[PDB]
Amino acid sequence: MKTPLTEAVSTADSQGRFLSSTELQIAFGRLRQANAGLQAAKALTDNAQSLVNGAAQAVYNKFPYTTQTQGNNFAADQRGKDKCARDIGYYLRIVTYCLVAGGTGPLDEYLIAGIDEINRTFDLSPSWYVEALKYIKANHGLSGDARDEANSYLDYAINALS
């Protein structure tokens, strides 16, 4: 997990040292960020269903072929649309987890690790998920710290996919 508290304790334990002022400053930055991250998580949670449906519709709009051509990897039928909505919901939910934890650790452990094999084996285009993340970033309606942190997680996922 890539979160400030776990990172600080991991660095100290690897050095076998007690927690010094460096780790205390790490905790202070975590405390300064945590409330904004938490209400961003709640804002994303309360608006989660509409955000996921809108992101799915944006992906379908930018890549219309995903809704017409047959194939297990596309969303032409309701099964594919449900899979697509579930994937975007996964992205949004682990993004909220990142906001709660204060780092990219949820994205790394739950979604990022091995995602290339996933998109290659089931021939899913990562550009679809990039478009979904861009919609979420453009429509989460956050401000200040909360917006910056949520956008950092969304762009982290975007950069991982590209």
Binding site: S10, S14, Q15, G16, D108, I112, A113, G114, A160
Partner: protein, 266 residues
């Protein structure tokens, strides 16, 4: 070992393994194979995700900037190695994982546990890891260009015999890995300078006939027993019981206060 013991112990692939040496003017596929072998053996045969790969370290290995020993050190010191072998493991389990991954053997003595524990407490994870890679054992066995490989199943110079037996406690098979927090199986064996019977591959199974129960499954219960009944004749005891009497054996072992060290299917 020879084939006849190798199939029984399930160590045929280890015996026929050939050491991999990065020679000068190696091609791209040779560096690829060396990197894959290092990831397989140093990370204890985990499914390594592409996001966990050491891209800069393997670039330096590719451009011949660093040696195989240096790349092994970089993988061992990496946060991936720390995450899956150090941060969620006890120190004794961590150093036996270091012995398996870096020197290809099981710990020989409890003093080797006292070493790398004091070394950790003084100089951190990095010094503790560098102890293995800079050791005489690593140098004489692998040098700067041979990927480390498991050596516990073969007779080594300056080796204790118990290592071979203890080897089967750290190498659980070819399709195994050191992925799952776990406690060392060698703690009591190392602390009291003992040996445990090898139950590996097909050695653990025992004859059943009509004595096994309804589902024809025997279980071996290795326990440590003392007088709490009848006369105890040995401190170590082994009980072979069917599945249908397993609970009964556990409870009568429990009410006599005997500690169960291991339970396996036989």
């Amino acid at each position: 070992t020879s084939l006849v013991s190798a199939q029984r112990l399930g160590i045929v692939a280890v015996d026929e393994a050939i050491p991999l040496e990065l020679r000068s003017r190696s091609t791209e596929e040779e560096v690829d194979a060396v990197i894959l072998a290092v990831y397989r053996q140093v990370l204890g045969n985990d499914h390594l995700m592409s996001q966990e790969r050491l891209t800069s370290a393997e670039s330096l290995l590719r451009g011949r900037e660093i040696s195989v020993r240096d790349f092994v050190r970089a993988v061992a010191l990496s946060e991936v190695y720390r995450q899956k072998f150090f941060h969620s493991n006890p120190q004794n389990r961590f150093i036996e994982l270091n012995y398996k991954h870096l020197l290809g053997r099981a710990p020989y003595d409890q003093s080797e546990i006292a070493f790398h524990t004091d070394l950790y407490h003084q100089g951190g994870y990095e010094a503790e890891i560098n102890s293995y890679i800079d050791s005489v054992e690593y140098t004489e066995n692998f040098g700067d260009w041979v990927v480390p490989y498991f050596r516990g199943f073969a007779t080594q110079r300056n080796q204790k015999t118990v290592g071979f037996s203890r080897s089967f406690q750290v190498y659980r098979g070819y399709a195994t890995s050191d992925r799952s927090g776990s406690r060392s199986r060698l703690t009591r064996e190392l602390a009291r300078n003992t040996a445990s019977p090898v139950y590996a591959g097909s050695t653990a199974e025992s004859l059943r006939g009509t004595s096994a129960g309804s589902r024809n499954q025997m279980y071996r219960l290795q326990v440590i027993q003392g007088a709490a009944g009848t006369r105890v004749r040995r401190g170590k005891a082994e009980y072979l019981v069917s599945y249908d009497n397993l609970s009964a054996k556990l409870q009568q072992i429990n009410r006599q206060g005997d500690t169960v060290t291991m339970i396996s299917l036989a």
